[PDB]
């Protein structure tokens, strides 16, 4: 199932009962995640800007008939933190590491909570969520999100899609450290069902291996 | 002095007395050089395809009322070797390293001469040209061109432009070695003035430092 706005700029794609992917065209798509929990809707990343983030939120709240309560920001770039203003106005908890928090205020954005640690485990009702900082890669602050109950990994901009021949913006990247960081992810999670790249189609463990090839 | 065509897809900007930069959109702009010599016109790289390449040739030949005698191909990608069939049927000598030639074949393009060695000095009438293979970077075969009379460096796709934050296609690239290869160019030419990127505005030695920054 894939719900979209009329222009198709925003879509939510179902992976399983309570796990959906959210994609918004900024014409450049960006992937995030939506989790339907007993404590409310939990998102992995916002969107390019406030309009899209506000529309996205109204979309999911309408679908699941519940309020978005928490959002996990994987890094301090527009496609991830572009809708911080909205979150705060709406009273939504914008989770992030302390580094992402400081880089956000540096990049000229409103400051997230800065509550997440290198390894943070959060249980939203029955939905178990793990955030993991693997080291520098796409950015110095990038983190990944893991769903141990489903063995699903949200790679963010640290992971490229299967057809990707590009690495994207590397001005703020640590290209040489990137490989080691992905190796850390491969080391931490031995059985992977699906991997969600920052942009593109959902894949599997291959997306990590493919991203390493691009880095060689 | 900048001259284009009725459609705007091909323009030629004068760098100096005998050196011009040719640029075509394919919708990304691609740069190459047009050298006006006492014995004909000499280009550094062709264009995205045979249609654009032929039109480019017809434009400069009409303008300088001379014939394009030689063309230097910097690597085996469409923006560089696209009009190879056009060159060969017009009797234009298509210079390239042996590696670029074999990769051209592998990529499905007609084969260039494969005559260029690591350091090849060519003189067309008055115009002096030096081709140099600095090692693997953007591709396995990329070379740079040096005009010793003007101290102008055509970095090709080995060098990113000032506003570029992306390295482009890295599927065929050797990211780790790309840094050592730019260092070889920096070490080879001690007094560089202008440097032409594969795509983007002409700059100076700072473009090489910028690209090394992106590679970090
Ligand atoms: Zn980013
Ligand atoms: Zn991204
Ligand atoms: Zn290329
Ligand atoms: Zn190029």
UniProtKB/Swiss-Prot annotation, chains A, B:
* Organism, as annotated: Bacillus cereus
State where Zn(2+) 1 binds. Answer: 75, 77, 138
Which reaction is this enzyme known to catalyze? Answer: a beta-lactam + H2O = a substituted beta-amino acid
Name its co-factor(s): Zn(2+)
Entry binding sites for substrate: 160, 169
Family statement: Belongs to the metallo-beta-lactamase superfamily. Class-B beta-lactamase family.
In which residues is Zn(2+) 2 bound? Answer: 79, 157, 199
Q: What class of enzyme is it?
A: hydrolase
- GO molecular function terms listed in the Swiss-Prot or TrEMBL record: beta-lactamase activity; zinc ion binding
Which CDD domains has this protein been placed in?
A: BcII-like_MBL-B1
NCBIfam families on file: bla_Bc_2, bla_class_B_core, bla_subclass_B1
| A GO biological-process term | antibiotic catabolic process
Designated gene of the protein = blm
How its function is modulated: the record gives:
Inhibited by captopril stereoisomers and iodoacetate. Also inhibited by chelating agents such as EDTA.
Cofactor binding: number and manner: Binds 2 Zn(2+) ions per subunit. The enzyme can also function with only 1 Zn(2+) ion.
Question: Where found in the cell?
Answer: Periplasm
Q: Which cellular components does GO assign to this protein?
A: periplasmic space
- What is the stated purpose of this protein? Confers resistance to the different beta-lactams antibiotics (penicillin, cephalosporin and carbapenem) via the hydrolysis of the beta-lactam ring. Active on cephalosporin and penicillin.
Assembly information from the UniProt record: Monomer.
Q: What is this protein called?
A: Metallo-beta-lactamase type 2
Keywords (A to Z) from UniProt: Antibiotic resistance, Hydrolase, Metal-binding, Periplasm, Signal, Zinc
Instruction: Report the EC code(s) recorded for this entry.
Output: 3.5.2.6
